[PDB]
Ligand binder design. Structure first.
Ligand SMILES: N[C@@H](Cc1ccc(O)c(O)c1)C(=O)O
Ligand SMILES: N[C@@H](Cc1ccc(O)c(O)c1)C(=O)O
Ligand SMILES: [Fe+3]
Ligand SMILES: [Fe+3]
Lengths: 308, 308
């Protein structure tokens, strides 16, 4: 029996009661494990995500001096690499983020302001997320152009390191690409392909997502640039991915879908997309091979999924 | 008159003439009921188990392409959840299983290689089992650190579903925990407690086994993780058990022993163990309340049970 999936954008509210309740900050090797203030601050962000409901403005939060310092360190260090490593779409929108969303070393941007900006560019919007969503729920939100976003920041003891996404990764890595119209369409196809798909295919789409949205490389002119969020928020891997060390392969979904990857070291290989439009087309073709007893359409006018 | 129980490890050979001779694959709603090739393949595995005798290497089998495909689908889909849901002991040993036992998407590990690896870690060993062993015989083997293991695989028509243990469940669910020394001691106490126990107590130990070895949750740091084999080999219940939905209760054997459970839907509640050593201690105390006119000791040097 087809697995449940949201049919309207409000139904995404059901995901809150389906996350992993025991977060990473509870593990003994998390950088802030022994810090009780950090632990409490993380619970505070989780309660905000838990009570959030579609349609409400995302709560603004006053970040502490220590958290602002961590953000500033990450921002300054990564910014130096963008003009030469990041793709054209990233660099084209960044100045607008500095100007209208407050992306600066001394200030952590508030998610509501960022969500409104994204809405104006492509209709994408953010919602705060407690802990880890299953792959199915996470990809499902993309169908409605909704991105589940963390609002907390990594522990300040290791500013250049995080074992989980945190706000620096969401804002410096994902956000700028969601402002591009073709990228937005591309990431929404992944979402649409996932609706009602069997569990084994969700894992394939999750693997495609990892090799594009998180760790993708794309052709630009006769050069190669990074557009993956995990690359764009990682100082070391960003420099590494455009050196001679990694193996580069053209994006071919049949192969990409079953490629193994490690989450703990730099990637041994990356897939290169010709463009986001082309990647979008490939996802759509791949989606036609997923055994679903139906077809889906998103109606942006009413924010509902039509089932055919 | 005290029910019979094996006194040496070879006597486990008597169990073969005591299984349920009419297996689940003979029921009309088994996924492979109408598949005559599957039916024959299942008989083939049953004959291997039937003729196996203690001391012989377990026969190697060449799995068909179709069976390998089913294993690959299950393995890929479950692997994605281990680093975040499975307990530390599971994750610590998995890489060694990939490296020395051939745990990979394209290959089904052979039981003899797995048994030799287990022997090296904790002295546990496997033996192939035909059909369903009574609870008494099944728990009795644990006293000798022997685990009765299925060698056949579920029908390929429903790779994410099985109404019975099959090889995916044994290898991805049980095996990794049997490589941990404390878990091995803990599961052996359950076995020792069962020897010569009255039928009504065997059912209590069977219920304790179900809520620990099959569906147990354990404390780790300040977090909670899965160690039950039924959870670790079930994609859906693994995500569900660490969400906010189930009721969690501390492991208390007096209560756990009489708790009812359903075998057909996700568990409404789970018992949380403090650690395997602590669970081991509780089984031992509980075992002292079982009315037996004697006491038992396992002598690992001669592989015999001493009766005191
Ligand atoms: N896909 C990862 C986590 C993840 C998803 C999307 C994004 C990100 O930065 C990280 C997991 O299920 O464990
Ligand atoms: N205890 C169950 C079967 C079972 C035992 C051990 C293990 C497992 O996965 C399943 C029965 O007697 O019906
Ligand atoms: Fe990310
Ligand atoms: Fe089992």
């Amino acid at each position: 029996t087809v697995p449940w999936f949201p049919r309207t954008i409000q139904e995404l509210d059901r995901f809150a009661n389906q996350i992993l309740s025991y977060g990473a900050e509870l593990d003994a090797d998390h950088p802030g494990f022994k810090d009780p203030v950090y632990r409490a601050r993380r619970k505070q962000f989780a309660d905000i995500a838990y009570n959030y409901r579609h349609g409400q403005p995302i709560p603004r939060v006053e970040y502490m001096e220590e958290e602002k310092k961590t953000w500033g360190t990450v921002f300054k260090t990564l910014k130096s690499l963008y003009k030469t490593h990041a793709c054209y779409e990233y660099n084209h929108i960044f100045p607008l983020l500095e100007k209208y969303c407050g992306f600066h070393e001394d200030n952590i941007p508030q998610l509501e302001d960022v969500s409104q900006f994204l809405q104006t560019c492509t209709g994408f919007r953010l919602r705060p997320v407690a802990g880890l969503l299953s792959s199915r729920d996470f990809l499902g939100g993309l169908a409605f152009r909704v991105f589940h976003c963390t609002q907390y920041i990594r522990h300040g003891s290791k500013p250049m390191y995080t074992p989980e996404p945190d706000i620096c990764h969401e804002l410096l890595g994902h956000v700028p690409l969601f402002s591009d119209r073709s990228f937005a369409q591309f990431s929404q196809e992944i979402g649409l392909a996932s609706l009602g798909a069997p569990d084994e295919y969700i894992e394939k789409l999750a693997t495609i997502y990892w090799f594009t949205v998180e760790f993708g490389l794309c052709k630009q002119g006769d050069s190669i640039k990074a557009y993956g969020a995990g690359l764009l928020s990682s100082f070391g891997e960003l420099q590494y991915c455009l050196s001679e060390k990694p193996k580069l392969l053209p994006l071919e979904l049949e192969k990409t879908a079953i490629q193994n990857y490690t989450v703990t070291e730099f990637q041994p290989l990356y897939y290169v997309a010709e463009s986001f439009n082309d990647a979008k087309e490939k996802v759509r073709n791949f989606a036609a091979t997923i055994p679903r007893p139906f077809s889906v359409r998103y109606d942006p006018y009413t924010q509902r999924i039509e089932v055919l």
